[PDB]
Design a binder for this molecule. Structure first.
Ligand SMILES: CC(C)CCCCCCC[C@@H](C)CCC[C@@H](C)CCO[C@H](CO)COCC[C@@H](C)CCC[C@H](C)CCC[C@@H](C)CCCC(C)C
Ligand SMILES: CC(C)CCCCCCC[C@@H](C)CCC[C@@H](C)CCO[C@H](CO)COCC[C@@H](C)CCC[C@H](C)CCC[C@@H](C)CCCC(C)C
Ligand SMILES: CC(C)CCCCCCC[C@@H](C)CCC[C@@H](C)CCO[C@H](CO)COCC[C@@H](C)CCC[C@H](C)CCC[C@@H](C)CCCC(C)C
Ligand SMILES: CC(C)CCCCCCC[C@@H](C)CCC[C@@H](C)CCO[C@H](CO)COCC[C@@H](C)CCC[C@H](C)CCC[C@@H](C)CCCC(C)C
Ligand SMILES: CC(C)CCCCCCC[C@@H](C)CCC[C@@H](C)CCO[C@H](CO)COCC[C@@H](C)CCC[C@H](C)CCC[C@@H](C)CCCC(C)C
Ligand SMILES: CC(C)CCCCCCC[C@@H](C)CCC[C@@H](C)CCO[C@H](CO)COCC[C@@H](C)CCC[C@H](C)CCC[C@@H](C)CCCC(C)C
Ligand SMILES: CC(C)CCCCCCC[C@@H](C)CCC[C@@H](C)CCO[C@H](CO)COCC[C@@H](C)CCC[C@H](C)CCC[C@@H](C)CCCC(C)C
Ligand SMILES: CC(C)CCCCCCC[C@@H](C)CCC[C@@H](C)CCO[C@H](CO)COCC[C@@H](C)CCC[C@H](C)CCC[C@@H](C)CCCC(C)C
Ligand SMILES: CC(C)CCCCCCC[C@@H](C)CCC[C@@H](C)CCO[C@H](CO)COCC[C@@H](C)CCC[C@H](C)CCC[C@@H](C)CCCC(C)C
Ligand SMILES: CC(C)CCCCCCC[C@@H](C)CCC[C@@H](C)CCO[C@H](CO)COCC[C@@H](C)CCC[C@H](C)CCC[C@@H](C)CCCC(C)C
Ligand SMILES: CC(C)CCCCCCC[C@@H](C)CCC[C@@H](C)CCO[C@H](CO)COCC[C@@H](C)CCC[C@H](C)CCC[C@@H](C)CCCC(C)C
Ligand SMILES: CC(C)CCCCCCCCCCCC[C@@H](C)CCCCCCCC(C)C
Ligand SMILES: CC(C)CCCCCCCCCCCC[C@@H](C)CCCCCCCC(C)C
Ligand SMILES: CC(C)CCCCCCCCCCCC[C@@H](C)CCCCCCCC(C)C
Ligand SMILES: *C\C=C(C)/C=C/C=C(C)/C=C/C1=C(C)CCCC1(C)C
Ligand SMILES: *C\C=C(C)/C=C/C=C(C)/C=C/C1=C(C)CCCC1(C)C
Ligand SMILES: *C\C=C(C)/C=C/C=C(C)/C=C/C1=C(C)CCCC1(C)C
Lengths: 222, 222, 222
C-alpha cells in the first residue's frame, strides 16, 4: 500500500502464517504430553504473531504519537504480540530445563514489565521520558538474560538444545532494544521501513527459527 | 432507556446475576477440592458476564465505530467478557476430562486468538477487513471444536456430562459467529436489538444453562 | 512539577524502587524453591508498583474524566498496578496456607472483578453510576476478605505469619474503597493530593511493608 514498510509487514504476515501451519501439521500425531506442551506453546507463538503482523499490515495495529515536534507512526501491535509470545518463548526454555515455577514466575513477570514498559515508552508523548522507559525495559531484559544463564544435571538431550536456543535468544532479543533505540520509537536514526524489516527478521527468527530448532529436536520429548 | 435493546441488556444483567448468586449459594458447603475447582470457574463465569452485561446496560461497554458509511454501535464489552469466560468454560471441559495442560494450553490460546481477533474485527474501520478478522476468529473457533471432539477411558461419571456439555458448547458457540456475521458488527442484516437478544439467549444458556447442567452432576466430584 | 500531588508520586516511586531492589538483593542466594516462589511474587509486586508510580509521576498514567460538571483527573495507572499486584499479594497468602487452586481461582478471579469494576467505575462518565461500580467492587473485596478468614492444621511456622499478614491485608485493603469513596474518583470530599498520599501510604505498606514481614520470616521456607 501507501506505506513503504508494507512489504515487510506482508512478508512477515506470510512467514508467520506458514510457520504456524507448518508447526500445526507437524504437531499432528503427537501424543507425548510433554511434546504436546512444546508444540502448543511453539505453534501459538507465530500464530499470535501472525495476527498482529496482519493487524499492522491492515493498519489497525498502527497509531500516531506526537513527540519531538512530529507525528510519529507507532506500531503498538508489536507489544500486544510480545506481551504473550515473549513469555511463551521463555516458557519453552523454562520447561526445557524444568524450571521451578518460582523462576518461571520471575521470568514471566520480568517479561511483562519489559513489554509493558516497552509499550509505555512507545506511547509516551514526552520525548526524553521515552528513553527512561526504554532503560527500565532494558533492565528487565537484562535481568531475564541474567536468569537464562545464571538463574539455572539436566538430561543431556535437553542440554545442547537448551544452550543453542538460549544463545539464539540472547543474541536476537538483545537486538530488539537497539532497533527500538535508533528507530522510529526512539532517536529516529533508522527509518521506519528499515526498522520494520529488522523487526521482521528478528521476529521470524526468534519465533519461527527458534521453533524449528526446538521442534526438530528430541529435547522436547519424554 | 433510549436504546431499544436496553431491555435485553437488563434481562441479561438480571439473569447473569441471579445465576451467579445461585451458584454462589450452591457452592456453599463444598469442600471437595475438585468440586471446589468447578464451582469457582463456574460461578465466576456469569459473575464476569454480569459485570459486562451491566456495563453494556449502563452504556459504558458501548462504542461507535465508523464504517460502511455509518456510525455503528459496537458493544466491545462482549469481548472483555468472552476473553475470560470463554477460556474458563473451556477450562471446565478440560478438567472434566482431565486434559493434559498441553491441550489446555492449545485450547486457551486458540481461544484468546478467537476473541482477540473477534475484537479486532469488531473495531476495524475498513468494512471488508472486518470479515477477514471474522474468518480468522472462526478458524480458531473451528480449531477449538476440533480439539473438543478430536483433541481428546474417562470415569463414566464424567463421560455423559462431558458429552452433553460438549454438545451444548458446539451448538451454542457455533451460533456466535453467525450472529456476528449478519448482525451489526457485520453485514447489518439483523438489527442490533435482535442481535443483542440472540446474544443474550446464547450467553445465558452457555454460561448459566451450561453451568446448571455441570453443577447438578456428580461428574464434578472426587 | 505543576501537580501538588507530585511529591507523593515521587516518594512512592522512590519507595517502591528501593523496596524492589532490597527484595531483589535479599533473594540473592535463595535456592529453596518454595522460598524462591515467595521471593519472585514478592519482589515483582513493588516492581510493578514502581513502574506504575513512575507512570503517574511522569503524567502518562493520568487521564481526564468528565463528570459531575467538572474535568476530573483520574489516575488509571493504579488499576493497571492492582490488576496484577493484588492477585499476586493474594497469591502470597494462598501459597502460605497451601490453598487448593479452586480457592486460588476464586480469590484471583474475585480480585480481577474487584479491580476491573474499580476501573470501570473510575472511568464512567455518569456520576451516580460510578458508585454502582464501587459497590460491586466492594462486594468482591468483601468476598475476598470472607475467604481470607472463612475460605481456609497448617505448619505452625506459617500460622503466625499468615494471621499477621491477613490482618494487615484486611485493614489496609479495606481502606482503599473508603479513600476512593471520598476522594477524587468519588464524592470529591478529600482533595487529590491528600488521596494520593493516602494511597501512597497504603500502597507501600501493603506491598513493601507486607513484604518485609513475609520475607523476614521462615514461614516462606521448606
Ligand atoms: C504482569 C506480571 C506484568 C506487569 C507489567 C507492568 C507494566 C504495566 C504497563 C501497562 C500500561 C498499559 C498502557 C496502556 C494501557 C495505556 C494506553 O495509553 C495510550 C496513550 O496514553 C493510548 O494510546 C492509544 C492506542 C494505544 C493502544 C495500546 C493498547 C495495546 C493493548 C495490547 C494488549 C492486548 C490485550 C489482549 C486483548 C484481547
Ligand atoms: C539512561 C539512564 C541510565 C536511565 C534513566 C535515565 C533515562 C534518561 C534517558 C537517557 C538519555 C536521554 C537523553 C534524551 C535527549 C538527549 C534529550 C533531548 O535533547 C535533544 C534536543 O532536545 C533531543 O532532540 C532530538 C534529537 C535526537 C533524535 C535525540 C535522541 C535521544 C537519544 C537518547 C539515547 C538514550 C541512550 C543513549 C540510552 C543508552 C544507555
Ligand atoms: C545480531 C547478531 C549478533 C549479528 C552478529 C552475529 C555473529 C555472531 C554474534 C552473535 C553471538 C552468537 C553467540 C554464539 C553462541 C555460542 C555459545 O555457546 C555456549 C555453549 O555453553 C553458550 O555459553 C554462553 C553463550 C554466550 C553467547 C551469548 C551472546 C551474547 C549476546 C551477543 C550480542 C547480542 C547481539 C546485539 C546485536 C546488535 C544489533 C546490538
Ligand atoms: C493470548 C494467548 C492470545 C493472544 C490473542 C492475539 C490477538 C490479540 C489482539 C488484541 C488487540 C487489542 C485491540 C485493542 C488493544 C486496540 C483498541 O483499538 C480500538 C480502535 O483502534 C480502540 O477503540 C476504542 C475503545 C475500544 C475498547 C476495546 C478495549 C477492550 C479491552 C477489554 C479487555 C479488558 C482487560 C481486563 C482489564 C481490567
Ligand atoms: C472469507 C475468506 C475465506 C477468509 C479470508 C478473506 C476474508 C474476506 C472477507 C470475506 C467476504 C468479504 C466480502 C466483503 C464485501 C462483499 C465487499 C463489500 O462490497 C459491498 C459494497 O462495497 C459491501 O457493502 C455493504 C453491503 C453488505 C452489507 C456487505 C456485507 C459483506 C458480507 C461478507 C460476508 C462474509 C462471509 C459471506 C464469510 C463466509 C465464509
Ligand atoms: C487462504 C490462506 C490465506 C489467503 C491469502 C490471500 C491472498 C491475498 O493476496 C492479495 C490479493 O489481492 C490480498 O491483499 C490485498 C490488500 C489487502 C490485504 C488482504 C489480504 C489479507 C487481508 C489476508 C491475509 C491472510 C488471510 C487469511 C484470513 C483467514 C485465514 C486464516 C483462513
Ligand atoms: C442453534 C440451535 C442449533 C437451534 C437448533 C436446535 C435443534 C438441534 C440442533 C442442534 C444440534 C444439537 C446436537 C445434539 C447432540 C447429541 C449428540 O450426542 C453425541 C454423544 O456422543 C455427541 O457426538 C457428537 C455430537 C454431534 C452434535 C454436534 C452438533 C454440531 C453443531 C450443530 C450446529 C450449530 C448450531 C448453528 C446455529 C445456527 C444459528 C448457525
Ligand atoms: C478475570 C478473571 C476477571 C474479569 C474482570 C471483569 C471486569 C472487566 C472490566 C474490564 C473493562 C476494561 C475497561 C477498559 C478496557 C475500557 C476503557 O474505556 C475508557 C473510557 O470509556 C477509556 O479511557 C481512556 C484511557 C483509559 C485507560 C484505561 C486502560 C487501563 C489498562 C491497564 C491494563 C494493562 C494491561 C497490561 C498491558 C501491558
Ligand atoms: C449503594 C447500593 C447498596 C449498591 C447499588 C446502588 C449504587 C447506587 C450508588 C449508591 C449511592 C448513589 C448516590 C449518588 C448521589 C447521591 C446522587 C447525586 O446527587 C447529588 C446531586 O445530583 C450528587 O452531586 C454531587 C454531590 C456529591 C459530591 C455526591 C456524592 C455521592 C455519594 C455516593 C455515596 C455512596 C455510598 C454512600 C455507598 C455506601 C454504601
Ligand atoms: C441489590 C441487588 C441488585 C439491586 C437491583 C436494583 C434494582 C434497580 O432497578 C431500577 C429502579 O430504578 C434501577 O434502574 C434504573 C436505570 C439505571 C439502572 C440502575 C440499576 C443498575 C445500575 C443496578 C443493577 C445491579 C446493581 C447491583 C450493584 C451492587 C450489587 C452487586 C451489591
Ligand atoms: C486504617 C487503620 C485501621 C487505622 C487504625 C489502626 C488501629 C488498629 C485498627 C486496625 C485493626 C488491626 C487488626 C488487629 C489484628 C489482630 C488480630 O489477630 C487475630 C489472630 O487470630 C486475627 O483474628 C481476626 C483478625 C480481626 C482483625 C481484622 C481487622 C478488621 C478490619 C479493620 C477495619 C479496616 C480499617 C478501615 C480503615 C478506615 C480508613 C475505613
Ligand atoms: C518447513 C520449514 C523448514 C520452514 C517453513 C516455515 C515458514 C517460514 C519461513 C521459514 C524460515 C525460517 C528461518 C528463521 C530465521 C531467520 C534468520 C529468517 C529471516 C527471514 C527473512 C527471509 C528469509 C526467507 C524465507 C522466506 C525462508
Ligand atoms: C436455580 C436455577 C434452576 C435457575 C436460576 C438462575 C437464574 C437465571 C435463569 C435460569 C435459566 C437458565 C436456562 C439456560 C438456557 C437457556 C436456553 C435460557 C434462555 C434465556 C432467556 C429467558 C428464559 C427465562 C428465564 C428468566 C429463566
Ligand atoms: C531494608 C528495609 C527494612 C526497608 C527499605 C525498603 C524501602 C522502602 C521503605 C521501607 C518502609 C516500609 C514500611 C511499610 C509500611 C508503612 C506503614 C510505611 C508508610 C510510608 C511512608 C513514609 C515512611 C518512611 C520511609 C521512607 C521508610
Ligand atoms: C517476538 C519475540 C521477541 C522474541 C521480541 C523480543 C523483544 C524484546 C526482548 C523487546 C525489548 C525491548 C526492550 C528491552 C527495550 C524497550 C523496547 C523493547 C520493548 C523493544
Ligand atoms: C459467553 C460464552 C460464549 C460461550 C461466547 C462465545 C463466542 C464465540 C465462541 C465467539 C466467536 C466469534 C467468532 C468465531 C467469529 C468472530 C466473532 C465472534 C467473536 C463472535
Ligand atoms: C496495591 C495493593 C493494594 C493492596 C490495593 C488494594 C485495593 C483494593 C483492595 C481496592 C479496592 C476498591 C474497591 C473495593 C472499591 C472500588 C475502588 C477500589 C478499586 C479502590
Amino acid at each position: 500500500t501507501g506505506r513503504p514498510e508494507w512489504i515487510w509487514l506482508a512478508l512477515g504476515t506470510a512467514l508467520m502464517g506458514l510457520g504456524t501451519l507448518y508447526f500445526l501439521v507437524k504437531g499432528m500425531g503427537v501424543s507425548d504430553p510433554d511434546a504436546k506442551k512444546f508444540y502448543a506453546i511453539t505453534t501459538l507463538v507465530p500464530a499470535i504473531a501472525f495476527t498482529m503482523y496482519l493487524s499492522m499490515l491492515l493498519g489497525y495495529g498502527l497509531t500516531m504519537v506526537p513527540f519531538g515536534g512530529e507525528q510519529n507512526p507507532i506500531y503498538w501491535a508489536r507489544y500486544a504480540d510480545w506481551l504473550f509470545t515473549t513469555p511463551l518463548l521463555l516458557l519453552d526454555l523454562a520447561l526445557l530445563v524444568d524450571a521451578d515455577q518460582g523462576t518461571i514466575l520471575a521470568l514471566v513477570g520480568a517479561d511483562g514489565i519489559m513489554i509493558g514498559t516497552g509499550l509505555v515508552g512507545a506511547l509516551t508523548k514526552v520525548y526524553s521520558y521515552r528513553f527512561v522507559w526504554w532503560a527500565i525495559s532494558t533492565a528487565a531484559m537484562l535481568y531475564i538474560l541474567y536468569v537464562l544463564f545464571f538463574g539455572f544435571s539436566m538430561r543431556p538431550e535437553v542440554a545442547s538444545t537448551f544452550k543453542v536456543l538460549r544463545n539464539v535468544t540472547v543474541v536476537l532479543w538483545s537486538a530488539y532494544p537497539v532497533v527500538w533505540l535508533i528507530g522510529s520509537e526512539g532517536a529516529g536514526i533508522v527509518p521506519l521501513n528499515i526498522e520494520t524489516l529488522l523487526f521482521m527478521v528478528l521476529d521470524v527468527s526468534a519465533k519461527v527459527g527458534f521453533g524449528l530448532i526446538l521442534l526438530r529436536s528430541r529435547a522436547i520429548f519424554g
